[PDB]
Amino acid sequence: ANRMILNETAWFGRGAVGALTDEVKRRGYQKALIVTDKTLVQCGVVAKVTDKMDAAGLAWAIYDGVVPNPTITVVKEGLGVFQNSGADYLIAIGGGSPQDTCKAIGIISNNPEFADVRSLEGLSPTNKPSVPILAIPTTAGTAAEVTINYVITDEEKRRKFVCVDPHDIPQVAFIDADMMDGMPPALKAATGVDALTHAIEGYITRGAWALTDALHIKAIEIIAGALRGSVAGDKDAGEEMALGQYVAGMGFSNVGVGLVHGMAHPLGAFYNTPHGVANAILLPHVMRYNADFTGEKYRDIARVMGVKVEGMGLEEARNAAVEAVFALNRDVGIPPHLRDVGVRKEDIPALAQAALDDVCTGGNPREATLEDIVELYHTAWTS
Amino acid sequence: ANRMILNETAWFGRGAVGALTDEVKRRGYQKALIVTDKTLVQCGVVAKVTDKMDAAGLAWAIYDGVVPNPTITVVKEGLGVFQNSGADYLIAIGGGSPQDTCKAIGIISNNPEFADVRSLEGLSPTNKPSVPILAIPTTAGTAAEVTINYVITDEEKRRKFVCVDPHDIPQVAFIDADMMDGMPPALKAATGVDALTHAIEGYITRGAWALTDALHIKAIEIIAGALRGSVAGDKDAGEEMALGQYVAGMGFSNVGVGLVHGMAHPLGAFYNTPHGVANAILLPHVMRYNADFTGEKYRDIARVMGVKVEGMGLEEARNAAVEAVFALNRDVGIPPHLRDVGVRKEDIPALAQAALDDVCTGGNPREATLEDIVELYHTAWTS
Ligand SMILES: NC(=O)C1=CN([C@@H]2O[C@H](COP(=O)(O)OP(=O)(O)OC[C@H]3O[C@@H](n4cnc5c(N)ncnc54)[C@H](O)[C@@H]3O)[C@@H](O)[C@H]2O)C=CC1
Ligand SMILES: NC(=O)C1=CN([C@@H]2O[C@H](COP(=O)(O)OP(=O)(O)OC[C@H]3O[C@@H](n4cnc5c(N)ncnc54)[C@H](O)[C@@H]3O)[C@@H](O)[C@H]2O)C=CC1
Ligand SMILES: [Fe+3]
Ligand SMILES: [Fe+3]
């Protein structure tokens, strides 16, 4: 039997954050800790929420120390602020980095045996639910608002570790493209192909079943249809991307992903490479490696990505699916090689071993050897 | 902005009730009240749950007084049992009738100013969440396990009233076809076409949007694909039906239905007509009425029900959707006319006023008049 964890409540559309003050009053919460980053404060995205809270007379404090690929140190800093704030709930404003930091703070506040942070890795044996979290994404992006995962960087051990825990699921998600419009086009592109990686890896993962298949192929269709338009600055395409990224999460949270995520995590740990850019570069290479273990699923992918599949045999449709991803990466200006974003040739053996050991790698439909991964890194390295 | 309420936790597949004892221990609950009907106790369906609970040492009491189209009296009697039981949670075992009774008991128990039951009608102004509900459907299905609605019969006033409350959402749904195999074929047929009615009405409802459209069209594809096989007693078809009826609820709970539900409720109240039979008989007649107000949606319906729409103009595709529902109804042995199920011609004026005043009617893509509804009851009445 298959489990699904989802948000009990989610609001979708431009103006969705408009529902937040009423959700807070109905729940009877007294004071928020807002978990975010300095950029979101600096650009006025956090004010879009706090101005509404002030108008409704709701108490809040703020922690804005979150950095990309958030570290054990960032979690402990935000824990200290939460525990000294007297807040009874959390509001996560931002991408994967603040949302994952917020999940770690909420879990530890109600489960103090785990306050060292690294002991949360894997299926966290938590006794108690998280401090309640209201989750507000600002990237079109990670679906952290709907997943049971969070990823923290262990700086001492040079590794990203995955914490999987139904106790961390947000009580409410607010998916509001008004919070996302300020993303630079390069960030829309990187978070957009991250969402596409989620959708494609989830579609072909080993745990895949009828319900996740239906969410994944819809997510692929929405994202492939909208990403070029959203990068270009189309307001409607931005609204489509906000939904697409979420629908992908509803699936992959519950069944898993594969080798793209497994290979992208070590790049994050070694070089602080943005998650989206690493995923985007690796995706078409990993799809080519997986092609023969995906049944007819690349023909569905090719179709929803606008390839004419009427005539094509399955082998041509598989190759056309991979070429559709190459062409999308080109079109939204993702760098084509790992060397371009600060990877070292010398590191690939260590990267390959960290990828083989990464939990995400287990979901890959083709059994990955150390030797295959080494070769996959070399292929994405350069011409 | 559009809201979605869903189950936070759901288990799917034959054996899913296997997960119940672990879920209870992790939540720390001390004592269940099981809400069910005498048929489900007698047939050994409730024993599929209680034998696992007895083996794990989990305490339970039972209220088995639920009747089809549950009444104010069934709610008040169940409430009395829950209060005297010392139970701290509810397990709903059955179709829409016990699941709707269980929602009512759980709400009133934590919001005792509603113990009259009548005052719950509409958007219930409840301050507290329901007593925690674990929901186990035995039909395929009303999707009551994942909706925020419950329907009670007021005997004194000869009317079914709809209670809509996010506070009533079950904490866990267990969707296990092993709990549904014992349905007689005629019960599989009627609850199956009720699920189809949910999916088709939800697909074309005024409030419809991108996410509910994706859920509803997948539900129609699954249900139209499986129902004949399930009624005929195919094991896999039964498992597909369990999933399809649920996916239908994920959508229609959040956006609404239409005139089929509006015209079915008064038949329930006047004659105690089974909900699924009334919907099955009315569905194709209301689809024919609505056809011009559904854009290209009947082409999608016709395609996923196995009609070859490639050549067809829109008028042939719309007719093809209607005829495919008439054909499914005949194939699974649903009676074609309301006269066959105990409706009286004399009552049609009173039924039509009840239907026009029903909350579900407001969702219909075509604005219904009293005269249009009278004409629709006559058309479904006889040859
Ligand atoms: N929880 C899960 O299941 C998953 C976790 N992740 C994690 O999420 C992280 C990546 O998160 P992302 O959302 O890609 O980025 P991020 O949260 O790391 O932010 C990247 C940068 O964009 C800025 N930014 C974000 N929204 C902005 C906006 N609206 N306008 C202007 N600037 C904005 C941020 O301040 C930051 O400098 C990684 O640590 C990754 O491992 C990724 C996917 C799955
Ligand atoms: N809450 C909601 O969103 C919705 C509410 N409803 C309500 O649900 C009710 C209809 O519920 P249904 O599930 O159609 O029927 P039901 O729960 O009224 O059951 C009909 C009969 O079938 C029997 N039965 C149930 N499961 C069985 C099994 N596995 N084996 C043998 N017999 C079995 C029951 O004992 C009963 O005698 C109506 O009151 C309707 O208004 C219907 C749809 C949506
Ligand atoms: Fe990712
Ligand atoms: Fe119904």
Numbering used by the authors:
A (entry chain AAA), B (entry chain BBB): 3 to 385
Which passages does the manuscript contain on this structure?
Here it is shown which structural adaptations were introduced by directed evolution experiments that changed the catalytic properties of the Escherichia coli (E. coli) (S)-lactaldehyde reductase [EC 1.1.1.77]. This enzyme, referred to as FucO, is also known as an Fe2+, NAD+-dependent group-III alcohol de­hydrogenase and is involved in the catabolism of rare sugars in E. coli.
One route produced the single mutant L259V (dubbed variant D93). D93 displays features of a ‘generalist’ enzyme regarding substrate selectivity, retaining reasonable activities with compound 1 and its physiological substrate compound 2 and, in addition, being able to catalyze the reduction of the more bulky compound 3 with 13-fold improved catalytic efficiency (k cat /K M) compared with the wild-type. The mode of binding of NADH in the active site, including the nicotinamide moiety, is well defined by the electron density map, being the same in both structures. Here the crystal structures of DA1472 and its parent D93 (L259V) are reported, showing that these amino acid substitutions provide more space in the active site, though they do not cause changes in the main-chain conformation.
